[PDB]
Each structure stands twice: as C-alpha cells, then as structure tokens.
Amino acid sequence: MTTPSLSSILRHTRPIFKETLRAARPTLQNALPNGFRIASESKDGDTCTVGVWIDAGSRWETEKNNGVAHFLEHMNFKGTGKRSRQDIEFGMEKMGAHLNAYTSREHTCYYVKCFKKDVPEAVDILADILLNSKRTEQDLDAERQTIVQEKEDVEARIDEVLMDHLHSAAFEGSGLGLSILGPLENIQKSITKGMIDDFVKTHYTGPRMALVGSGAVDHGQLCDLASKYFGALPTGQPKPSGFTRFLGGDKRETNQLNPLTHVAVAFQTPGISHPDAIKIKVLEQLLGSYSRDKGEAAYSCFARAIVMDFYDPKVGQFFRPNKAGHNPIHSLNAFWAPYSDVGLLGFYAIAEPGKSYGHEWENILHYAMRELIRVSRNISEEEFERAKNQLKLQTMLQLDGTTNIADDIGRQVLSFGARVPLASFFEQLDAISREDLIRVAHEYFYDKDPVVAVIGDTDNVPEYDALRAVTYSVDL
Amino acid sequence: EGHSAYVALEQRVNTRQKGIIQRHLSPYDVDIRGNGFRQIYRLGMQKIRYFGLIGTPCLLVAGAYRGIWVFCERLEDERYWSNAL
Amino acid sequence: NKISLYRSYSTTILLSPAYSLGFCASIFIVIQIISGYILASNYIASTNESFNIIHNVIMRELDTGWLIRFNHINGCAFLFIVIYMHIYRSLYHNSITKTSVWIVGIIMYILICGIAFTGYSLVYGQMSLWAIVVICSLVTAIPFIGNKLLILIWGGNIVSSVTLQRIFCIHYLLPLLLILFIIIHLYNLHNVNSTGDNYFINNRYDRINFYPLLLIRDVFIGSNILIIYNIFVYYYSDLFGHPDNYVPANPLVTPSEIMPEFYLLPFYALIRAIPHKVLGIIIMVLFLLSLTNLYPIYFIRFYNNINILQRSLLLLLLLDLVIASKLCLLINHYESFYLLLILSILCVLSHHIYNTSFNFSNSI
Amino acid sequence: MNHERPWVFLNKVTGKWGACGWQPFWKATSQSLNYIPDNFIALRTNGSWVRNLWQSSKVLDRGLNASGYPTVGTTDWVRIPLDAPLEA
Amino acid sequence: ATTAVSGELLTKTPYTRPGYAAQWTCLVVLFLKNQLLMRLFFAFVAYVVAMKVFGARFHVD
Amino acid sequence: MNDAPILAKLGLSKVNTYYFQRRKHIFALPITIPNFPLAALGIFRSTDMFEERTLERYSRDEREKTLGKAALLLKEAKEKGNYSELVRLDPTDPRHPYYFEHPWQSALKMDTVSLTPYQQYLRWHCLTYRAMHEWDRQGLLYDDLMQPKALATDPFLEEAILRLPYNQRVERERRLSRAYDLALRREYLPDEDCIHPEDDVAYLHPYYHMVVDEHREQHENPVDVYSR
Amino acid sequence: LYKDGPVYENIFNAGISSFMKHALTKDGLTSSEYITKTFLQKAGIIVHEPTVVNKSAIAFTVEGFRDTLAQPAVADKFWQSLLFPRFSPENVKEVKRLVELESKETKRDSPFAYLQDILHKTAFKGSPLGHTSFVPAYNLGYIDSNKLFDRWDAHYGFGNIAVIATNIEHEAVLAAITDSAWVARAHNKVGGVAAPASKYSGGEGYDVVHRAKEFDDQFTDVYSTYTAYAFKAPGRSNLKEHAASLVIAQALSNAVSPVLNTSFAPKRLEVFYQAYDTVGLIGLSSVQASNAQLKAFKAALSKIGTLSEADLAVHK
Ligand code: HEM
Ligand code: HEM
C-alpha cells in the first residue's frame, strides 16, 4: 500500500443539517353520531387510496381463539350476502385495482388504491366485505390448509420469528404476547365459526373504526358514503383496559446450523400515547443503525462502540495483541415497538456466530450495555442534535405515496384519536431538553430487567443472568 | 509451543516462507577443533575493541572518583594525625 | 515419544554462555532450600538457645553440620552474586521488553532480599540483633502509626524470643513462595521465549530444540560455577561475613560499626545519604517501585533498541553502586566521604533504564 | 419545562364541561423587575387558548356530541384540545 | 541508493569507514555532552549538602 | 538530499530534520518506568540523537510539506493524465509526499556552509556513530532492526510491515535471516560488502509515518466526544 | 451514475465491476470512508448502498432533505470518491469478503434474483448482456488493486458520469456540483465506453444446485425448483413499443397474481419485464412449475395478442 492517504492530513468540510418544511393540506376529520371516524388528506393527483382501519388485532385473544383475527381476515374475502368471491374479484379487476388486507397485533386495515372515479365503488366493496360478509363453516373448513401453509411459510422468516419470540418472552399471559397466526393445533381444529362471530361482534364496533382517504379524494363525498354504509355500526363496549405486565427474561432458540445469529434485547417503555413518546423516539434515533457496508463509518456512539473493537489492535503491556480477523457484524438497528399500553425499546444485532466458545458476542453485548448506561448518565449536545434531525428526516421518509400517507393517517387516528400535524409534531421536537432525554434514558435502561430473544448459535451468546448484571456499574 | 506469544508474532509478521534451503551436518562428521583457534582469536579481538569502546566513560569517571578518594583519604589522615577529630 | 519431547520447546541459537545465569540461580535456590530444611530440623528459636544450638549442637554434634551451615551461608552469598549478574545481563540486552518476565523477576528480587535479611536475623548474634534494631528504628519513623506498628512487629519494646520465633516462621515460609514465583517466571519466559545475543523474529527453521543441548550447556556452566562456589565453602567459609556475629548478642552493648551483608549495602547507602528518615523511607519505597514496569497501563508504550551509549552508562551504574556501598561503610570514621557518597547516590538515582519515546513531542 | 397544553374535560352522561390544565407553582420569594412572565400554562403559544375557550363555550354548553374524542381512563370524561376553535 | 528526482542513480560519494580513534572520540564526546554538566552539578550539590547538613568539614584546623 | 530541489522550490529547507532537533520541555511526562527515581521525571536526559521521534509527526509543518509535495504530484497528473502512475510511486521515490531520508544518506555530499558548529558536530557524529554499531558489516539496513515484540507491541510497526510490497518484505526477511546466521559466529560480511551510508535507505519510515497519520485521522474528526 | 457494469466485462474480468461497486466507496486519496460517510450521516443524509442498475452503470445514491443535498459539500465528496481513488489492498480484501457474502446471500435468500442472473446468462449466450452480475469463484482471488486501477483508467472520463436529482431545483444542482475545487484539480477528459448488442437463447436449460445439502432448511426454502419461462420483448429504444410491452406485462401480471391480497400471502410467482436498449425479456418465474402452467401462460399471452381497442381499455 504505497499510495498515501491525504484524508488524514487534509482539512475536510462538514455538511450541516437544514430541514425543508413543505406545507401539506390539513388532515380533515369528522365523526358520525355512531362514533365511526372519517379522516382524509387531499393532494393534487389522479390516484387515491381509500381504506378502512380497525382497532382490533390479535391483542385480544386468550389462547383459545388465537389466530381468529387472521382467520377472519381470510374469511372476509370468501364472499358476502350480495356478492361472491368471483364477483368481488371481478369488481376489483374492472376497477383495475387490488384489495390489500393487513393484520397486526393491534390494528387491521383493508385498503384499495384506485382512481378518483372509483371511490364510491371501492367504499361499497369495503363496506360489503366488512359488514355483510357471510362466514359459513364450509368455507371455514376450506381455508384451514391455506392458513397452515401460510403458518409454515411465516415460520421461515427469521426476523418475524425473532420478534414473535421477543413478544412471547416479554408479555406472557396476555394476548399481546401471542403470535398473529396462532398455534398450528388451533389453525387445524380449534378455531370455529362461533369464535369468529364473537370476535367480529365484540371488536368491529363504531368508535373503533375509521375510514381513511388519501390523495385526490373529496372529504364531503367520503363523509356521505360513510354515513350511507357505516352509519349503522353498533356503539359496542369500550376497548378492553387491562394490565399487561412486562416479564424480563429470555427466549433462546438453538440452531447451530444457521449461518447468522440474531439477538434482540429490549426494555419496557410506556405506551405510544404517553408524553414520553417523542423522547423515546429521539432515543431510538440516538442509538442509530449500522450496516456492514459502512465499515468503520458508524455515526453513533452506540454502534461505533460495538464496531471499533473488531478494528482495534488491542495491544497491551503484559498481553499479546488480539485483533479480530474481520468485522463480523452484519447489522445493528435500534427499534421501538409501542402499543397503547406498553412498549419495547431496544436493539437488534445480526452477526456471524464465530468460532465456538469465542468472545465476539461477549464483547458485542458488553459494549452495547455499557453504551446504554453511558447514555443513561450523560448525552452530548451534538449527538442530541443529530438524533433530533434524524428523527425529523425519518418521520418525513415514511410519507412516500398515497398508501403510506393513508397508513400513517389511519394509525394515528386509531392511536391518538387524530392525526398530529407535522409542524405541531416538530414544534414538540425542538422543545425537548437534553436533561429530559437523559432522565428518560435513565428511567428505563439503568438497572432494569430486559427481555432477550436469540436465534442461532446460542453456544456463544451470553445467558440472561450475565446480561442482567451489566445493566448497572459499580461506579454508577 | 503453537499457542505461544512468539509463535503468534511470527505468524502475524512474517510471510509464508518460501525458497529457503538449509544444510546441516551431523555432529559425528564435524570436528570440534575445526574452527577453534580462528574463532578464539576473532572473538578475543572483537571483545577487546568493544570493551575499549564502552569502558571509556567508566574509566574516566573512575579516575575522577580516584582523585576525590585520594584527596579525602589524605585529608582524613591529616585530621587524625593532628588530634583535630 | 522422544521426538515429541525434543520439539516441545525451541529457542534461538544465539544463547551465549551468559544465558545460563538463570540455571545457576536455580542451582543455588535448590542448595539453599535443602540446607535450610536440614538446619531447621535442628534449630530452636529463642534468646537462650539459638546462638548455642548453632555453634554447640549443629556444628559439633553432627558429622558435617558445619558443612551444611557453610553451604547455607555461602549459597546465599552466591545466589545474590548470580542474581546481580542476571539482572545486569538483562539490562545489557534490553530484556525489559519481556514485561511479564521482568515484573516477576523484580518481585522475586525483593522477596529474596527479605528472605536473606530474616535468615541473618536467626543467628542471635551481635550483628543480627543490632541490624534488627537499626531497621526497626527505620520503621518507627512512619508518621502517626509508627510506634505502635513497631510494637506489633516486635511483640514488645525489645527483640525477644517471640520475635525470633516469628522471624523463623517467616524465614521458613518465604522461600517456598519464591519457588512459586520462579515457576511463574519460567512459565512467562516460555510464553515469550529468550532474547539471545541479538533480537530476531525466527520461524521454526531458524530455531533449535531446547532439549538436550541447552540442558548440557547448563550442566557445564553449573559445574564450573559450583567449582567456584565450593572454593569459598571449604577455604573461605567466613569471607562473606562479619566476625561480630560470632559474639552472642548483648543488648547492653552496641558494636563499633553496624554493617549489613554485602548484598544489602546499596540499600543501606540510600539511608545514609538521605538525612531525613521519612524522606529516606519514601525514597527507598520509590526506588523499589520504580524498578518495576507497572506504569503506564492504558497509555500506548512500546520499546525501542539499545545502543552503545546506554551500555556504557550501564557500566557506569555498576561503578556508582559499588562506590556507594564502600563509602557508606567508610563514612562512620571519616566524615569527608559524605561528598563522594552523596555524589554516587545521586548518580545512581539518575540512570535511565527505559528510553522514554515521550522525550520528544510538541506543544498545543 | 414542557407539559400539555390546556384542555377541556367533558362528562357525557352528566353532560358537564370545564377547562383544565397544568399549573406550575414554586415557593414564593422576591420577583424580578425586568421580566413579565411568559405563557406558562400554554407553553410556546401566543395564548389563543383563551379565545378558543371563549368561542367554544356556547358550543359546549349547548350540547356537543363528542363521541369522536378520546376518554380519560375508565371514567365518563373526554378531553377536547384547545389548539383550534371548536365548531363541530 | 535512492534515485534522483529525474529518476537516475548517481555515483556514490567516496567513503572510508571511520577508524577506531574516530569512534572512540565520538563516544567520549557524546558521553561528555550527556553527563559532564549533570555530574558537575551533582558534585556541587553533594558538597553543599555534606558541608551543611551532615557537618563534613573538608579542612583541618 | 535527493528531495532537495523539491524542498527548495516550496521554500522549505534542503537540510535534514535530524538537525533542528531540540528540547522543549523539562518534565518528560507521562513518567515511565522502569527508571530510577530522578530519571523517571526526565529533568536530565541521555540521548544519542538516533531516537525515533515519532510524536513529532504530529505537527502542522510536516503536514504542510506533505500536502505541498502531493499538490505537485496532482498538478503533474492533471497536466499529463497519468494519475494512477503518480499515486503508485514507491515511497523511496523522492517525489513521494512521504519520502524520508536517514541523516547519513546525505552527510557526505551536503553543502555544510549553512550549518552551525553544532550541526557540523551532528553530521560528524551521525556518520561515525553509524560506523560504531557495525550493522552495515552484517549486511543489514537500519530499518531492518525495527522489529515488533511479542508483548507491548508497536502497533504501527506491525502494520507498517504489512504495507510493504511482497518482494521487499521477503528481501527484508532474508537479510534478517542472513544477519542471524552471521551473528551465530559473530562473523561479518566481506569488507567489500560493507553497506555504503548512502545505500542505507529508510525504506520503512514512509510506511511507518503513513500508518501513524492514518491512525490519528479518526481522533481529529470524532463522531462524538464520548465515542470510542 | 458511473458507467461500468457486467456489459463491459469479459470472461477474464467477470465480476470486476462488483469490486468497483465497493472499492470506489472505500477509502480514497483525499477522503477516507470514515470521513465521507460519517460526515454525510451526521448531516441527516441517508447513504444508500451502491447498486448496478441496468447491468451497465453503478448508481451511488444519497437521500435527504433537499436543502441538505443542495449544499456543495455532498457533491464534493462524491466527486472526490469518483475522481481520486486509492484502491488500497486491505480495502480490496474487505471488498472481496463483501462480494463473496453478496453472492452467497443472493443465492440463499433471493432465489428469484439468482434465477434472473441465470436467465440473462443463458438468454444472451455470446453477447454482453449475458455476462454474470455476480463474481465467479475463480475471479475472487484474481481481482486486486492493479486490475482495479487499469479498469479505472480505461473507464475514466467525465463523459462516464451523470448526476440525477428528483426534488431539487435544477439551478441549485448546478450550483452544487460546480463549486468543487477537486473537479478543477482533475485531468479534463471526455472518455466514452461502448458495448455491442445482444441476441437471445436462454433455454430448456439448467443450473444445478442441491439446496437441501447447501443451507439449513429451517429459515430458507430448500425444496423448490425455480423455472423462468421468458420471451423476447422490445426495449426502451422505441417508446411506443415500450408502452405496449408495459401494458402487456401489466395484463399478464394481473391475470396471474391474486386480486385479494392477504397479510402473509407467500411469494410463488413473478411476471417480469426486463427492458434494455433495443432488446428485453418478458416472462414468468415460478416454483414447482408445470408444463400445463407454462402452456396456460403462453396461451394467455397469445390471447392478449388478439384483444381489441375496447378490450384493451381495462388493461390500459
Ligand atoms: C525453606 C527454606 C529455608 C529454610 C528452612 C531455612 C532455614 C534457616 C535456618 C534454620 C537458619 C538458621 C541456622 C543458621 O543460621 O545456620 C537459616 C539461616 C540463614 N538462611 Fe535460611 N532457610 C531457608 C532458605 C533460605 C534462603 C532461600 C536464603 C537466601 C539465600 C536463606 C538465607 C539464610 C541466611 C543468610 C541465614 C543466616 C546465615 C548465617 O547463619 O550466618 N535461607 N535458614
Ligand atoms: C531467583 C532468582 C532468579 C531466577 C532463578 C531466575 C531464573 C531465570 C531463568 C531460568 C531464566 C531463563 C534463562 C535465562 O535466560 O537466563 C530467566 C530469564 C530472565 N529473567 Fe530471571 N531469574 C531470577 C531473577 C530475575 C530478576 C531479579 C530479574 C529482573 C527483573 C529477572 C529477569 C529476567 C529476564 C528479563 C529474563 C529473560 C532475559 C531474556 O531472555 O531476554 N530474573 N530467569
């Protein structure tokens, strides 16, 4: 390597962050006397996304009907009293559109992307499937095998299996810690028409449903259609308000034949509607993310602390140098999963298992927990500013396209009761204090019980007890 | 020996060696007197020159200390011989 | 598998005969251990029987108890001589780069000084008693808790039978810890290997098997040094000693000159050259601590080569230490030697062992 | 300091409303001559919430169907924000 | 043995290895510049300390 | 020096930096041991003027010189469009921005008119003190004797050796093994094989310096004050 | 956009562009990888992994607020990267590791992407579009700093670089990429590279891999066979024919994919239309394909052929 490196001698120019704030049309919202909500954000264009967001996921199941939400999702597409499955598909095809159904732990949505001239027909089909769909036993028995195949397919996604493990470990004894699809024995035998009908009756109520429109749409037309179709929904009982206890612990799946090891460590945080929501988001952006293509170019104190020990020569006075052959980290990502009651804030690390009985994962978790303690004690102003700017950009990056905007509108309407204007959100983001952020970090990280999920060669990943002993330091 | 610090060092620093030919004779075919007098002479001369080099500062300082020692010794002899103690 | 025995450890070919000093020191450690174990089997520690049981029981009731005692004495003296040569060679060849080996060696040196002192205390003679008294008078200069400390060391206001018994237990115990430290010394060395005459990084083709060539060389050098050793045992048995230790201890009388053994004299000089007792204690502690290499710990430090100027300065250090020992003994009668004593001590304290690469840097 | 902007509680079954907010308070001592306190109940605002409350009083007392607003725990009270005037 | 800026190798300047007298002189001068003043200063300090602190006299009568 | 015309056209000095070495501090801190007490402080220092002086690479003047030479290379590349060639010169090429010369490589052919008496002494000392160690009679180069140790390794040094071209690494190792074989008998190469002072090239110091700079790069542009 | 890719390689350089994909993003002469990426990442800019677009160019893409991208420092860093490379051996070793991982992961986790690679390799047999997008095993040892520098010299020239922006006013962009001193310090040269055209075989034809013996079965699919049935279609050269091909591809895709999509619907089919300059492919990639299925697909395409103006309105 005879070529010199002038970057070590030169004076480099630092780019600075300067945000762009385009004023979007305000999100209008109305509510029928039934309580069904109607939210709409209009923008110049030729295509619009129209959907229904429902506030009933798999969070409300007691292991006797686990997966009934997904069964219901599959059953809504099998025909209604008026139309058949062939008729619904024909209507969608004539409109040249696709009807997408998505089911999560605390939200479901059925949405259609169409032209502005197909809005009434799309809303008609949505109401038809949601309200008037007949769910007979025969069809229920004809979808069991397709759902079994879907279960077997989703069991093969390592990231999804890892997050399911994390939730099963964290929330045991409540539906929030159950898998979306449910046990195989439940898919094949237990779930029944009675369970599906009970779920629909209990959770598809007026005040827990919203009709969302994004793009070239008319709010008045949407309101008229919503009154026409969704005005008869019952004002059923309120959303259940129970206590979901967080259980620190570990869920470790051993598979020594896997090429990569996935380790997620999470801590309990308050819900999404807590005033600490923005501070937790800023913390998530403070920990940052790292990908292997960056090498040593990690922009956060966290990822960097975990990466530079595989480039450090580790020369000591009385010991031989111990430098890693290569950097084994595939990726590091900070995540926050919130829910109306609770939350999981943590990191997700993917790296090679390494030599058996090595020290790679010991070092990774050592430095990860040290950085958590450090941010609990002190945070620098420059990194605070970096985190806030990155939160601004990340919040803006999620609003690409009418479908994404509609998804954001629906989720915020179901969670906070109304969409928070971006400016308003940003107004609350420049009022955060470094001391407040430090207090939030110390409240939930220091000397707390974490939940760990591991998939891969658990021969090298430290066990829970050790991990519980590194959330605090003797010096403090 | 394979798990030793010097072996680790040689593996880190040195390349994979190639093109080295070594010839060894069994000691039963080597005369113990073979290179004796020549080596005695050469090593004696080398050590004489080297010690002449590195011993000079010590010689100079020892000379100064000898001067001081003589002065102090005869001063104390004079002190004792005159009951000045 | 004899072949597997040959190749279990390999060294450089540049091991000149000067690299057998460790083996000679091992020989003398073995001699001291065996002789001391035989002596202790005939020894009673008290102010009424100690001196008598050495000169009237050990040396006159056994067949060669005198020979055992002379072995113990002259083996201590020669162990110290060989250790000093070992240290001087290590400094000459810049062996401070072997950090583990050097630190363990310094620990062993301090331990051996302690062992020799406590052993010399067991012959309850005039010199033993009064050396104990002088060293403890050094002890009582500690601020605040000195006097009480002294009592705890002596178990009383004077040296007595309990003092001799605890000294005997210490003298018995310490050499075995010294054996363990020798084992650690060798373990670290075999981890990092030997320097040789010059430092090179060698692959297996440039190295040679340790066994049996270096064992045979060690036997040869050991036999020669044992000839030299036994010349002193049988014909100069009392050359490394002071005759006043053949006078039974008299607490009411102090000797004309209290002088320690030749191998502790340099330390004694450091006490005579510093008028303030507390300052002398502090400087002795700093001297011993500074012989080590325990600082810096987390600052990047590495070692460069050694040159002719450094070797000449090392010879000068030897000269200064010898002069300081002789002068510190001579100052009792002649007061004009304080000049040369202080000059030599100051020269000793200003000798560079490690060339600080931090000598050269730039300011902000 | 950064707390919630003032809101309006409204009880459904009883049909009775009322404003509310977070009042900071500190131990009394000497004041400052060169300082007129900023807006502390509604931080970082031009104090329009008073105007919104005044305008919305007629709407609320007349009877408002607030089924589209979040509740407060398990009680019969719902929170109406005073960011913008209430017309419904 | 390094090339010139133009890329060619020039003729080495003639050189006769310094002799033993030159080496000995170099070592003596180096030692003197390293420690002559230091040791003179230490001698002075020792004289002052001995003549004042320890009470050495250095003269008779 | 062979770099003299380049150093002159940039307004720098045609004289080696071995001259101009000077002491600026009284205490040599951090205090390092093993060292006898006073010598630990560093009030009195013993040097033979052949020390490395690596920490003096952290200076603005050295950076200015390096960037001046780099600018000359880039200007030539723009003129002729041989960029790759010019950024792949051997560090022993005087046009390289990191070219380094040992003092004795220019002592026999130096002007010496712009030299003070102390610097003339330094020149004479450099030549004769090189002659005093007899590594030239062992067929070695000075840079061959910079070898890493097993414990308390010189990190830069190790890396500096891995940056060398393969053939030059092999030649260095072969020179070391030949010197080892010679040292077994304390033999010297034939007098006609003595290394000329101008042949004792500093072929490893440019790599050493480049490694030092690259390692300090991330320290002067930290991600955050508390990062690692 | 930097002009280099598989279409410019030969059988002895196969995969070299992949090294160029990463080598340019590693340490350069005037700015290392640490200096650039961190400086961009701490400025609220998302730095994407470089990609090969149409087997003929490498895109280095950056995403962020327009005001942050309009400043002349981001463009300056990209200019530094592209004009003053270093190609250090240790960086090349890192790039070798990265390309090995990319090939292996795409084979294991993106069987359809690997199938596309095979489809092109055998589709355009003796033509530039049939070169491999992944480094073949042998070349993993062969490509090094000297080869990278030779390729960089061959491909050097401002004519091989383009700038593309999507939410920045044009003038601002011109104000950003023209304020660089490094552009003024670089050899001024317009150097173009050209590649020949292509023909089309593909085939009843086969790349054999025993996946069940290569990967662990739990978290990847190892019991499936990937069949791509493809036909020749027009490229982007003629806009009318390209739009017609887009309509045909959408008609085929909608007639095969489910209309009502659920959350966890598996991926079993894909209707692809890869369009190039003057040539393209349109086809169906599937698992556990069958003769009946492929005959039905061909018949559906033929039926699409006979549609009238009125029947073409829905698909349009
Ligand atoms: C466990 C091993 C040892 C035991 C049991 C032991 C035991 C004894 C005993 C009982 C004495 C008093 C008898 C006498 O003075 O002749 C003595 C004296 C002595 N020992 Fe040891 N000793 C041991 C190791 C050592 C070592 C390693 C040294 C240091 C080289 C040492 C140095 C001395 C000295 C200097 C004396 C007094 C010499 C004299 O009598 O004038 N001993 N030892
Ligand atoms: C009981 C006293 C001691 C014994 C028995 C002892 C024993 C040994 C032995 C057997 C070796 C390996 C053989 C050799 O190279 O000579 C050795 C090496 C060494 N010892 Fe000691 N040692 C002692 C005291 C010391 C002391 C006080 C030091 C000073 C710190 C020291 C420092 C070293 C060093 C540096 C080496 C390695 C030298 C080199 O190969 O470069 N030793 N010792």
Numbering used by the authors:
A (entry chain Qa): 1 to 476
B (entry chain QH): 2 to 86
C (entry chain QC): 2 to 365
D (entry chain 4j): 1 to 88
E (entry chain QK): 31 to 91
F (entry chain QG): 1 to 228
G (entry chain Qb): 80 to 395
Question: What text does the study give?
Answer:
Euglena gracilis, a model organism of the eukaryotic supergroup Discoba harbouring also clinically important parasitic species, possesses diverse metabolic strategies and an atypical electron transport chain. It usually involves four protein complexes (CI-CIV) constituting the electron transport chain (ETC) and a single complex V (CV) to drive ATP synthesis. Here, we report high-resolution cryo-EM structures of Euglena’s respirasome I + III2 + IV and supercomplex III2 + IV2. Euglena gracilis is a free-living, flagellated single cell eukaryote and belongs to the phylum Euglenozoa which also harbors several important parasites including Trypanosoma brucei and Leishmania donovani.
Overall 2.81 Å and 3.06 Å cryo-EM reconstructions were obtained for Eg-SC I + III2 + IV and Eg-SC III2 + IV2 respectively, using a mixed protein sample purified from E. gracilis’s mitochondria. Altogether, Eg-SC I + III2 + IV and Eg-SC III2 + IV2 have overall MWs of ~2.6 MDa and ~1.4 MDa respectively, about 1 MDa and 500 kDa larger than their opisthokont counterparts. The divergent structures of Eg-CI with a matrix FAS domain and of Eg-CIV with an inter-membrane space (IMS) helmet domain were clearly revealed from the supercomplexes. A helmet-like domain next to the cytochrome c (cyt c) binding site is also observed in Eg-CIV, likely contributing to the specific recognition for its endogenous cyt c28,30. Notably, core subunit Eg-COX3 lacks three TMHs compared to its mammalian counterpart possibly due to the evolutionary pressure of mitochondrial genome streamlining. The leftover space is occupied by TMHs of the nuclear-encoded subunit COXEG1, which introduces additional NT and CT extensions as parts of the matrix and IMS helmet domains respectively. Functional purpose of the Eg-specific matrix domain is apparently maintaining the CIII2-CIV association solely via three matrix interactions sites (Supplementary Discussion). Among them, the Eg-specific loop and β-hairpin on the NT of CIII2’s UQCRC2/MPP-α wedge into a cleft on CIV surface, formed by the matrix parts of subunits COXEG7, COXEG9, COXEG10 and COX5C. Lack of IMM or IMS interactions sites between Eg-CIII2 and Eg-CIV creates a prominent cleft between the two complexes, a feature not observed in other eukaryotic SC III2 + IV1/29–11.
